[PDB]
């Protein structure tokens, strides 16, 4: 119930990037500048190479984002991978054996543990590790959500821009016409990828805060709720009840 | 009998998409605009890049669908994968052990369970999980069915459209002829893929509602019907009868 | 003897399709229209893209089949896969254990089963499942056989056709010459693939109906014939006889 | 000694086909027609596409074979695979256990079988299955041998032929020069592949008929000769002799 | 806690290089020189081949780094791999058995080791191997950090440079215009890769020196801290305490 | 000591062929004819296709070898594979058990075999199988050695030759200039591959004849020398001696 | 400690070659000759094919090395693989059992070997096999080191050379301009690969001679030093000491 959130919050940005690259290769380069009819095949591939590199040199913040939208979406994916990567390396040895301990000792009682819960309750160290692995996960969803909302928010006739190559010794020339109407290509594919990654991230925002309500769902309030999720040995206690 | 429906309702849209891409690569780009004879090789590849991106900017709803038909068909495939993905994570631990429990205890009787069914009958919690995993599956087939029917319903001379590139600084020019008869290419392959995915989805519509008739097929009406499907231990009870 | 038929009736159409695609890639596009000498490299690739898409818009039934011959051959392959896919999911648990049952109980007799066959004989439920898995297999071979015969039956100078692109705003022009002699390319490879898939399917037509003669080959007439095919425990009964 | 023949009679045609395709891709298309200097890049690729398809429409039998030489060599490879595929599905269960039977019972004699051979001798059913799996293998080598000899027998200036494209509406024109000297390319690679597949198939022709001399090599004449080939339990009988 | 640092300090430079090459292939060559309109397709590919090779022959140190930025980033990755490669080949046999030794002998005490720690404390040979495997790791991070900071520090209009090909017999000619404004392409992708590899390496600099504080975290100060990390047998000593 | 010769006499020709193909693809076609400036792109690819096929039609023996040098080197590789392929199928069952026989019986003597060697000595059947598997291997090295020496022996300005295409209806024309200076490309790579495959095959020629001196190294002279190579049970007889 | 040297002395030349080929493919052919503007696309690809083959025909020794630098680096890699390949086939059976022999017999002493070392000391046969496997390894590093130093030593404007194609019937012509300024491309990548393979091979030269000091590190001087490297049974002798 909690591993499924951190697999569709990471796997879904990975799926859209791989689908974007099969669309990126099957059409061509992400820029396409309208070179004049006088240029050759190589000079017309110079302008598509210059203008794709010169979107950063001087709003300008809309144009800079379209180049790196697969990268920022990638960085927001591996940064959701690290709280589960740190959960398996910090709080996994402290939880694997102690669930095995209660799983074996409850067999011999029906064939101590009542004073186990009285002293494991007052320990505010492992519930703090649990919420900080999910509160950091919650805000990094919303930072990814506000970026995905901002990228869709522009949505304008903004992929079209005007660049020029007359910078170096090409300045003060008589062949280049000083203006090149370029246009980014993959914007419309990215605008739809910025929506279906936003609606999912909005629909998972009540679910991730539903895990932050473990009394309604101290350390006993954490520990009593984990035993019926990944441990099938509690299901034999219902076999005690159904016979009577 | 129920895993076979959710494998051919998901595997069949996956098969058509992979066959479409081998047809998409082996011919070329999905758009092909008739550029003039005056244009170069690069300006003629500008118009195929502009017009393929400018189908969304202003019926228009036929033309927008042809670009994203592999994507909408993909989204309708993974959304049929989630009710079985949630079935293996919610109702699978509550059903694996209790079928193992009756599978072992019925051996020692011929070598209790009669009062097991009297109290497992009045429990309207796990039949509700069963129908909601299939009723949500039923309507999401019909929403996929009505989209596939609507895409085939247009079928017109609608792939041909007229676009223009005179928008930015290319506006007020004297070389571009203001109109470009473009045409989408993969429409005829998609119209046949929208039929053989519709006839299958119509032919599976009585089957998925046939699973929604579990009395004619409460919790006992659910639980008595599962034991002769994935459990071979009931076949020894016929070995009790055939000897007598 | 019966798994070998449903592997060469499915594997043989799969082998011809994979061999066709290596021939399809190594030559080029399946259409090749004779564009005029006045056209550019891109306008000449427009006509090959328009005419390959416009074979369906208005005999015409010969020309429509040549585009989709790998698809119809593919659909006739997976539709032969489903009666064995349903045999392993419906009649496989009802037959795996009961063959194991006689395989063990006949050991202890020489170290009941004589009254086993007297009551398993009068059961017309599992022989009906056996013939319907093969009678449906028989007619779907003949429907595939009559399509393969019809595709070879045309064999004419029919790949050559005449198309025109003057439809949209390209209508009422003065550059396009109103007629384009196109020709499909992979027809001659497909005509030979339609023969060696027909001669095999004719030669397997007496074999598949030879399985439909199980008395000369009720439920006892089905059940007595399966035990000497996939079960090596009957071979020890000959070791009983050869010692005497 | 007999599995090695049916692996180099099948693996050797598979090896030459894979080596031919790496030579076929690394050079180009198998046809190369000398288009005029007036034609464009696309019209010159029309003639290479028309003439490669129009070798069948009206000696002509030399030219038709050069297109399908990888296919006929492939069909002669899988048709040598079927007598071993039928040997493992028909005569393999009748021979696996009975060799295991003598392999175990001869241990306890030195720790019946003398009357085993007196009644297994007069059985003309399994030697008939053995020779028909090899006599059918023998003639299908010679049919492959006479085709490989006939293909090498032409060896002429026969790849060069003259084709014309003036058939449809291209007939009665004033631009096409009515004759196109084409030439197949991979003929010289195929002529050498038709020799080293002929010398091997001639050198294996005495070996395959050497297996057809099982008295000099009834059912006892078959059965006594198999026990010292795939069965290492006969080697302990020499350990009986070497101690004495 | 220490294997996670040496996997994200090595895996993160490996991830950026693989992402850079998919961006390097999908656009084109890293150089793009503006050849004149008079040149052919091959002479214009000469200048892109000459100028990409002639960045080293005579500041110049900015231009030389842009060619080899994937190589220097690769060399700084495998040089972080060698202190863990030497740790598993030098100090791994001296630590695998002795942790197994205390793991077994502490079972039989509750079912010597108190004098074990009194003589294993005064041994300054294995703590010296531990710090030198991490102090060498610390400075090689900072040398990688100062290079990544220096590469981002230039960030100028420095990818644009001017080269000339008039060197050999091409000197004293009348066709080449003596100057070619070239421009490297992947600089802007590399400038962003030089930032997200710098912020991570700064944020890991307090963590790697936090491992260099093993008293606050002699040989006993090393050995007492390893037993509760990779060894689950110490968790049973808490099972001694929780029962009392 | 003898498996290492037949792995570097087979693996080394396989390694050079795979390295040749990566050089063959990365440059282009093996022929490159200097077509005139008047020809188009397709007619200039006709001459490279005609002349590459017409090296066999009429010294001429130098030019024919350069086309098929990867094939003749391949045929000399699989022909060194067959004496080890026949050794594992003819003399392997007669040698696996009898080495296992002495390996077990010598344990119980120290816990018959002295009369074993007196009768296994006079058997001139299995030493004859041993030398003929290596004498046939020896001469097939020298035939491969003399071909590799002859190919390097030409080494001339012999890749350059003159071909003409005026054969069929292209004869009696007025456009083709009757002579085409072609040149094979991969000759210089092949001349170096013909040296490092010759120096190895010369340096292995004393080693393969060193195996043909088994008295200085009858059947006892063969059998006594095999027991200390692949059998570790003879090493315990030194443990008998080192204790005394 | 000695397997790590022969894995980074072999794996490091393998890594640079694979990185060179990804740079070789992503740019183009290793030669790039400045063909005139009059030549076609095919004649300009003739000169790049002629001049790349004609670097050997007549300092000249610098130019010949640049073609075969990946091959000579490959030959120096597999020649470091053969002393470990011969170590596992000659001195591995004589060392696997005798280390197992002392590993078992020392258990029963604490639960002969003192006279084992007195007679295994005076045996100068297996130490001679040890040094010759490493002395041959030492000089073949230095021969690889002096070649790598010599290749970096040239480093000049030496990739640029002048070739001509007027050799055969192309001699005495009036179109070719008699001189072609070519230039090798991958030289600058190879000059950096010749440095980082030299600094490693210099830094491993004291390590490989450190293995040649086995008294300071006869047969006892060899045999006493191997037991604490790959054998964990000596670590129990410290468990004898730490208890006392």
Numbering used by the authors:
A (entry chain F), B (entry chain C), C (entry chain E), D (entry chain D), E (entry chain A), F (entry chain B), ...: 34 to 91, 99 to 151, 195 to 300, 326 to 352
Publication excerpt:
Pannexin 1 (PANX1) plays extensive physiological roles across diverse fields of biology, including cell death, inflammation, cancer progression, and neurological disorders.
Cleavage at the S2 site is essential for the activation of PANX1.1 We generated CT-cleaved PANX1, named PANX1ΔCT, via Drosophila effector caspase (drICE) cleavage. However, the dramatically deferred monodisperse peak of PANX1ΔCT observed by gel filtration (~1–1.5 mL) indicated that PANX1ΔCT underwent a large conformational change or that reasonable disorder regions were removed. We therefore collected the cryo-EM dataset for PANX1ΔCT and solved its structure at 3.1 Å resolution following a similar image processing strategy as the full-length dataset. Surprisingly, the two structures revealed almost identical conformations except that the density of the intracellular region of PANX1ΔCT was weaker. However, it is still not sufficient to stabilize PANX1ΔCT in a distinct conformation under the condition of cryo-EM sample preparation.
